[PDB]
Amino acid sequence: MQVFLKTLTGKTVTIEVEPSDTVENFKAKIQDKEGIPPDQQRLIFAGKQLEDGRTLSDYNIQKESTIHLVLRLRGG
């Protein structure tokens, strides 16, 4: 299934992922697009912060789902 990723600028990207995919792999796809190390990547879905140890299916993620990416710099 294809998902939409949002950046800090408000850009919508179409990436291909699967329920059997692990958060880690996800961050890898973003890196190849944004070029930012997972150490500075932060995915927040439905308020919850996806962990590099869990997967998409873990959070009952479906197709057409959108996720927000963050840099993580003690902001807020």
Coordinates of N, CA, C and O in Angstrom, one line a residue:
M1 N 0.8 -1.2 0.0 CA 0.0 0.0 0.0 C 0.9 1.3 0.0 O 2.0 1.3 0.5
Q2 N 0.3 2.3 -0.6 CA 1.1 3.6 -0.7 C 0.6 4.6 0.4 O -0.6 4.7 0.6
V3 N 1.6 5.2 1.1 CA 1.3 6.1 2.1 C 1.8 7.5 1.8 O 2.6 7.7 0.9
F4 N 1.3 8.5 2.5 CA 1.7 9.9 2.3 C 2.5 10.4 3.5 O 2.0 10.4 4.6
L5 N 3.7 10.9 3.2 CA 4.6 11.5 4.2 C 4.6 13.0 4.2 O 4.8 13.6 3.1
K6 N 4.5 13.6 5.3 CA 4.5 15.1 5.4 C 5.8 15.6 6.0 O 6.3 15.0 7.0
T7 N 6.3 16.6 5.5 CA 7.6 17.2 6.0 C 7.3 18.5 6.8 O 6.2 18.9 7.0
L8 N 8.4 19.1 7.3 CA 8.3 20.3 8.1 C 7.9 21.5 7.2 O 7.6 22.6 7.8
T9 N 7.9 21.3 5.9 CA 7.6 22.4 5.0 C 6.1 22.2 4.5 O 5.5 23.2 4.0
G10 N 5.6 21.0 4.6 CA 4.2 20.8 4.2 C 4.2 20.1 2.8 O 3.2 20.3 2.1
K11 N 5.2 19.3 2.5 CA 5.2 18.6 1.2 C 4.7 17.2 1.4 O 5.0 16.5 2.3
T12 N 3.8 16.8 0.4 CA 3.2 15.4 0.5 C 4.0 14.5 -0.5 O 4.0 14.8 -1.7
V13 N 4.5 13.4 0.0 CA 5.2 12.4 -0.8 C 4.5 11.1 -0.8 O 3.8 10.7 0.2
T14 N 4.6 10.4 -1.9 CA 3.9 9.0 -2.0 C 5.0 7.9 -2.0 O 5.7 7.7 -2.9
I15 N 5.1 7.3 -0.8 CA 6.0 6.2 -0.6 C 5.3 4.8 -0.5 O 4.1 4.8 -0.1
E16 N 5.9 3.8 -1.0 CA 5.3 2.4 -0.9 C 5.8 1.6 0.3 O 7.0 1.5 0.5
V17 N 4.9 1.2 1.1 CA 5.2 0.4 2.3 C 4.2 -0.7 2.5 O 3.2 -0.8 1.9
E18 N 4.6 -1.7 3.4 CA 3.7 -2.8 3.7 C 3.6 -3.0 5.2 O 4.4 -2.6 6.0
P19 N 2.4 -3.6 5.6 CA 2.1 -3.8 7.0 C 3.2 -4.6 7.7 O 3.4 -4.5 8.9
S20 N 3.9 -5.4 6.9 CA 5.0 -6.2 7.5 C 6.3 -5.5 7.5 O 7.4 -6.0 7.9
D21 N 6.3 -4.2 7.2 CA 7.4 -3.3 7.2 C 7.7 -2.8 8.7 O 6.8 -2.5 9.4
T22 N 9.0 -2.7 9.0 CA 9.4 -2.2 10.3 C 9.7 -0.7 10.3 O 10.3 -0.2 9.3
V23 N 9.4 0.0 11.4 CA 9.6 1.4 11.5 C 11.0 1.7 10.9 O 11.2 2.7 10.2
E24 N 12.0 0.9 11.3 CA 13.4 1.2 10.9 C 13.4 1.3 9.4 O 13.9 2.3 8.8
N25 N 12.9 0.3 8.6 CA 12.9 0.3 7.2 C 12.2 1.6 6.7 O 12.7 2.2 5.7
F26 N 11.2 2.0 7.3 CA 10.4 3.2 7.0 C 11.4 4.4 7.0 O 11.5 5.2 6.0
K27 N 12.1 4.6 8.1 CA 13.0 5.7 8.2 C 14.1 5.6 7.1 O 14.6 6.7 6.7
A28 N 14.4 4.4 6.7 CA 15.4 4.2 5.6 C 14.9 4.8 4.3 O 15.6 5.4 3.6
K29 N 13.6 4.6 4.0 CA 13.0 5.1 2.8 C 13.0 6.6 2.8 O 13.3 7.2 1.8
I30 N 12.7 7.2 3.9 CA 12.7 8.7 4.1 C 14.1 9.2 3.8 O 14.3 10.3 3.2
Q31 N 15.1 8.5 4.4 CA 16.5 9.0 4.3 C 16.9 9.1 2.8 O 17.6 10.0 2.4
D32 N 16.5 8.1 2.0 CA 16.8 8.1 0.6 C 16.1 9.2 -0.2 O 16.4 9.5 -1.3
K33 N 15.1 9.8 0.5 CA 14.3 10.9 -0.1 C 14.7 12.2 0.5 O 14.8 13.2 -0.2
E34 N 14.9 12.3 1.8 CA 15.3 13.5 2.5 C 16.8 13.5 2.8 O 17.3 14.6 3.0
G35 N 17.4 12.3 3.0 CA 18.8 12.3 3.3 C 19.1 12.6 4.7 O 20.1 13.2 5.0
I36 N 18.2 12.3 5.6 CA 18.4 12.5 7.0 C 18.5 11.3 7.8 O 17.6 10.4 7.8
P37 N 19.6 11.1 8.6 CA 19.8 9.9 9.4 C 18.6 9.7 10.4 O 18.0 10.6 11.0
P38 N 18.3 8.4 10.6 CA 17.2 8.0 11.4 C 17.3 8.6 12.8 O 16.3 8.7 13.5
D39 N 18.5 8.9 13.2 CA 18.8 9.5 14.5 C 18.1 10.8 14.7 O 17.8 11.3 15.8
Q40 N 17.8 11.5 13.5 CA 17.2 12.8 13.5 C 15.7 12.7 13.0 O 15.1 13.7 12.7
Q41 N 15.3 11.5 12.7 CA 13.9 11.2 12.2 C 13.0 10.9 13.3 O 13.3 10.1 14.2
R42 N 11.8 11.4 13.2 CA 10.7 11.2 14.2 C 9.4 11.0 13.6 O 8.8 12.0 13.1
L43 N 8.8 9.8 13.6 CA 7.5 9.5 13.0 C 6.4 9.5 14.1 O 6.5 8.7 15.0
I44 N 5.4 10.3 13.9 CA 4.3 10.4 14.9 C 3.0 10.0 14.2 O 2.5 10.8 13.4
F45 N 2.4 8.9 14.6 CA 1.2 8.4 14.0 C 0.1 8.4 15.1 O 0.2 7.8 16.2
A46 N -1.0 9.1 14.9 CA -2.1 9.2 15.8 C -1.7 9.5 17.2 O -2.1 9.0 18.2
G47 N -0.7 10.5 17.3 CA -0.2 10.9 18.6 C 0.9 10.0 19.1 O 1.9 10.5 19.7
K48 N 0.9 8.7 18.8 CA 1.9 7.8 19.2 C 3.2 8.0 18.3 O 3.1 8.2 17.1
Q49 N 4.3 7.8 18.9 CA 5.6 7.9 18.2 C 6.1 6.5 17.8 O 6.6 5.8 18.6
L50 N 6.0 6.2 16.5 CA 6.5 5.0 16.0 C 7.9 4.7 16.5 O 8.8 5.5 16.4
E51 N 8.1 3.5 17.0 CA 9.4 3.0 17.4 C 10.2 2.2 16.4 O 9.5 1.5 15.6
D52 N 11.5 2.3 16.4 CA 12.3 1.5 15.5 C 12.2 0.0 15.7 O 12.8 -0.8 15.0
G53 N 11.5 -0.4 16.8 CA 11.4 -1.8 17.1 C 10.0 -2.4 16.7 O 9.8 -3.6 16.8
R54 N 9.1 -1.5 16.4 CA 7.7 -1.9 16.0 C 7.5 -1.8 14.5 O 8.4 -1.4 13.7
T55 N 6.4 -2.2 14.0 CA 6.1 -2.2 12.6 C 4.8 -1.4 12.3 O 4.1 -0.9 13.2
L56 N 4.4 -1.3 11.0 CA 3.2 -0.6 10.6 C 1.9 -1.3 11.1 O 1.0 -0.7 11.7
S57 N 1.9 -2.6 10.9 CA 0.8 -3.4 11.4 C 0.6 -3.4 12.9 O -0.5 -3.6 13.4
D58 N 1.7 -3.1 13.6 CA 1.6 -3.0 15.0 C 0.7 -1.9 15.5 O 0.0 -2.0 16.5
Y59 N 0.6 -0.8 14.7 CA -0.2 0.3 15.0 C -1.5 0.3 14.1 O -2.1 1.3 13.9
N60 N -1.8 -0.9 13.6 CA -3.0 -1.1 12.8 C -3.0 0.0 11.7 O -4.0 0.6 11.5
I61 N -1.9 0.1 11.0 CA -1.8 1.1 9.9 C -2.4 0.5 8.6 O -2.1 -0.7 8.3
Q62 N -3.1 1.3 7.8 CA -3.7 0.8 6.6 C -3.2 1.7 5.4 O -2.3 2.5 5.6
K63 N -3.8 1.4 4.2 CA -3.4 2.2 3.0 C -3.9 3.6 3.1 O -4.9 3.9 3.8
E64 N -3.3 4.5 2.3 CA -3.8 5.9 2.2 C -3.5 6.6 3.5 O -4.0 7.7 3.8
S65 N -2.7 5.9 4.4 CA -2.4 6.5 5.7 C -1.3 7.6 5.6 O -0.4 7.4 4.7
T66 N -1.4 8.6 6.4 CA -0.4 9.7 6.4 C 0.4 9.8 7.7 O -0.2 9.6 8.7
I67 N 1.6 10.0 7.6 CA 2.5 10.1 8.7 C 3.3 11.4 8.7 O 3.7 11.9 7.6
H68 N 3.6 12.0 9.9 CA 4.3 13.2 10.0 C 5.8 12.9 10.5 O 6.0 12.2 11.4
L69 N 6.7 13.5 9.8 CA 8.1 13.3 10.1 C 8.7 14.6 10.8 O 8.4 15.7 10.5
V70 N 9.5 14.3 11.9 CA 10.1 15.4 12.6 C 11.6 15.3 12.7 O 12.1 14.2 12.6
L71 N 12.3 16.4 13.0 CA 13.8 16.3 13.2 C 14.2 16.0 14.6 O 15.2 15.3 14.8
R72 N 13.4 16.4 15.6 CA 13.6 16.2 17.0 C 14.7 17.1 17.5 O 15.9 16.7 17.4
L73 N 14.4 18.2 18.0 CA 15.3 19.2 18.5 C 14.8 19.9 19.8 O 14.9 21.1 19.9
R74 N 14.2 19.1 20.7 CA 13.6 19.7 21.9 C 12.7 20.9 21.6 O 12.9 21.9 22.2
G75 N 11.8 20.7 20.6 CA 11.0 21.8 20.2 C 9.6 21.6 20.8 O 9.1 20.5 21.0
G76 N 8.8 22.7 21.0 CA 7.5 22.7 21.5 C 7.3 23.5 22.7 O 6.6 24.6 22.6

